[PDB]
Symmetry: D2
Subunit: 109 residues, 4 copies
């Protein structure tokens, strides 16, 4: 999927994808955006831990946590509690949007 909803996480090795774009939460704790085999953007935190996870929070903050639950990296966009989405777009941009402004209200459970 190319969307990471608030309240969800990407475990080590999991990623967002779109066309030839891959945004993966690597094993070495480096969160990289690849265009095929070319690294376009990264948090540059590789080697700072092992088996990190990416968290899209309900406060709007995108945080990379180590297994001890320590913030290795963050987008620093925390604040208003609500519904946010982190999207790996078709234009290669990875953007955080929120909060929800309108909804049909047809969600399931």
């Amino acid at each position: 999927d190319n969307i990471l909803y608030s309240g969800e996480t990407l475990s080590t090795g999991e990623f967002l994808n779109y066309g030839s774009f891959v945004f993966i939460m690597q094993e070495d704790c480096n969160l990289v955006l690849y265009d095929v085999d070319k690294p376009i953007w990264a948090t540059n935190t590789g080697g700072l831990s092992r088996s990190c996870f990416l968290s899209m929070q309900t406060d709007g903050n995108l945080v990379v946590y180590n297994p001890s639950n320590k913030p290795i990296w963050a987008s620093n966009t925390g604040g208003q509690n609500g519904n946010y989405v982190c999207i790996l777009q078709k234009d290669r941009n990875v953007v955080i949007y929120g909060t929800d402004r309108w909804a049909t209200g047809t969600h399931t459970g």
Copy 2:
């Protein structure tokens, strides 16, 4: 695709899709959400005109226009000018999120 970006338009017959979920801008001008063949939600504007288009605007408003550019239906969520997305989620909810809070800034043209 399941995302409609601000500045984009869905022409009559065009839709957003996810699994068995289809959010379509019908030729009768009724914007409907179907679960397989079952209509789950609609604007109930069918028959009000012909060949409408759905537009996700930069003001945050999702508007159904007819060929003459007369608004047939609107989410009425206009406001801050910016970047918004309209998503047909995996939970079957259609939500508008915005504006953008953060971005890797790795887009290409």
Copy 3:
């Protein structure tokens, strides 16, 4: 997914999807191909049983089984044992292809 591989089955209510096309193994045992809410093709086995499952076999035969395990519909294309695929194509055609003629051999699990 738009592909059903040999050795795989679609349980009741499960489907193959592509754009607005939905190929679903319904609870009433009718196997229908939908284009939005319009029934484009069906096995016409609706009501013959309940809770059927669709099986794409390793002999190339696509069979619909009822809970008692008796076939109620089949493509009748059983033949050479091997690898086959049932695809819901972008042109709206549902085709069975096989067997495999070549492969990179880069498979994993």
Copy 4:
């Protein structure tokens, strides 16, 4: 997309994709299968030309052509003229299947 239909061509820089898998016809004439940034398989024709194209033929042959239309690589599976598909599978295998054994005959265009 993850499927290349017989009669279709992938120009240089064009690819098949699925998850973190990318099957790309590069500009250097090398046809590589990547798992994220790691090359899992290649035709090894890099540097033999420029701006090559990949063709899934109706005779079942998957061929890499140069700008002058000279074959630079092929699966060597040319045979009976029919309908074939080259699929980048979910198991990470790239396989050619054919010919078509059955169809619903619900295609357009």
